[PDB]
């Protein structure tokens, strides 16, 4: 919930700078048909950038207004120095993905063998 909204806020602030960089590159490539395309691209970039401002603002308000009961411990008092059913669901999903990954590894091994065989034969045929 809130821990995912925080990741959303992270990806928004990581993407806004990339959007500004793309806008800078577009203004740089704009030397003097194609002008209409550049203009509509810049306008769409600006609109999506303002939408990103609104999204990051709202997620900021959310994470600030949340402040769950479990936050009495300030920072630096949390780092560890020297001196239920959710876990069952996790284990089940882990076993399932392990079986699927073993099967996919078998498939990839067979595909690699096929490709190597075909390449060797088509090379030696010459």
């Amino acid at each position: 919930n809130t821990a995912s909204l925080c990741r959303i806020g992270q990806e928004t602030v990581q993407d806004i700078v990339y959007r500004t960089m793309e806008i800078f590159q577009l203004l740089r490539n704009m030397q003097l048909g194609t002008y209409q395309d550049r203009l509509t691209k810049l306008q769409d970039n600006l609109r999506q950038l303002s939408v990103l401002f609104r999204k990051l603002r709202l997620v900021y308000d959310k994470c600030n207004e949340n402040c769950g009961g479990m936050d009495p411990i300030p920072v630096e008092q949390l780092i560890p120095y020297v001196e239920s059913e959710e876990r069952r669901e996790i284990a089940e999903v882990n076993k399932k993905l392990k079986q699927k990954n073993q099967q996919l590894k078998q498939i990839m091994d067979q595909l690699r063998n096929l490709i190597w065989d075909i390449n060797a034969m088509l090379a030696m045929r010459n």
């Binding site: 990806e11 990581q14 993407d15 700078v17 990339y18 500004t20 960089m21 800078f24 590159q25 203004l27 740089r28 704009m30 030397q31 003097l32 088509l122 010459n126």
Partner: protein, 263 residues
């Protein structure tokens, strides 16, 4: 011409320097000597400052004499000036912002062969020394034979608009010219080291999305290997061990270097 523009700009500064230097000589004289804590020190300080000021007037005058030898409508000029300004500003901004990128992840091929052919032809248009011969003996995967003067014969192996393997060979050596000798060696250690450095450059020049600037930079870095056997180690002499000058050319800096020396 541009050289004339620079000479005029340099001269304008030189006139400003001469006027400022002459004013400085008189302005400092008006203030006169300062106590300086010692009789010898005060006399020396005044003489040194006056002499430096007098010399600066002579230097500035000399530059002006030497620089003499070397050399509905207003809206249009305003638009020209704003276009130049936006070009420079956006270039600097794009450089400074793509130099430092805060992107950390992506999660929040098929390509037309004629497009690859057009890209290769565009790249072959520039660099008149290099000649690239397109060929597709095995599938859509293209194989490029790149001749660099009488120096190199590189064998690039495209799988897509992507560089996968490179094996440079000597000019006198035979690429067998036909069904292309993709798998072989140059039989000379220098060209083998050059193949290693070319694979290193391939692993270095790897742009994520755009597949054209990577090939552009690879061809530009290969073109640097035209002054091979003729350029110094910029740290070592011509033959550091017995490999030639530069098996290595620094990326971002087309300077020769021996692999044994560094870089």
């Amino acid at each position: 011409v541009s050289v004339n523009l620079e000479a005029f700009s340099q001269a304008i500064s030189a006139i400003q320097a001469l006027r400022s230097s002459v004013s400085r000589v008189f302005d400092c004289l008006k203030d006169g000597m300062r106590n300086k804590e010692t009789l010898e020190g005060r006399e020396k300080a005044f003489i040194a400052h006056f002499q430096d000021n007098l010399h600066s007037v002579n230097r500035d005058l000399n530059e002006l004499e030497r620089l003499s030898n070397l050399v509905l409508y207003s809206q249009l000029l305003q638009a020209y000036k704003w276009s130049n300004k936006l070009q420079y500003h956006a270039g600097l901004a794009s450089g400074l912002l793509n130099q430092q990128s805060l992107k950390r992840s992506a999660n929040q091929l098929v390509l037309p062969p004629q497009y690859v052919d057009d890209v290769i032809s565009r790249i072959d248009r520039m660099f008149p020394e290099m000649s690239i011969h397109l060929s597709r003996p095995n599938g859509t995967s293209a194989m490029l034979l790149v001749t660099l003067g009488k120096v190199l014969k590189v064998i690039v192996v495209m799988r897509s608009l992507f560089i996968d393997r490179t094996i440079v060979k000597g000019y006198n050596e035979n690429v067998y010219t036909e069904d292309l000798d993709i798998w072989s060696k140059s039989n000379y250690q220098v060209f083998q080291k050059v193949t290693d450095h070319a694979t290193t450059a391939l692993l270095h020049y790897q742009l994520p999305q755009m597949p054209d600037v990577v090939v552009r930079s690879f061809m530009t870095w290969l073109r640097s290997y035209i002054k091979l056997f003729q350029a110094p180690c910029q740290r070592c002499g011509k033959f550091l061990q017995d490999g030639l000058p530069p098996t290595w050319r620094d990326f971002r800096t087309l300077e020769a270097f021996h692999d044994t020396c560094r870089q």
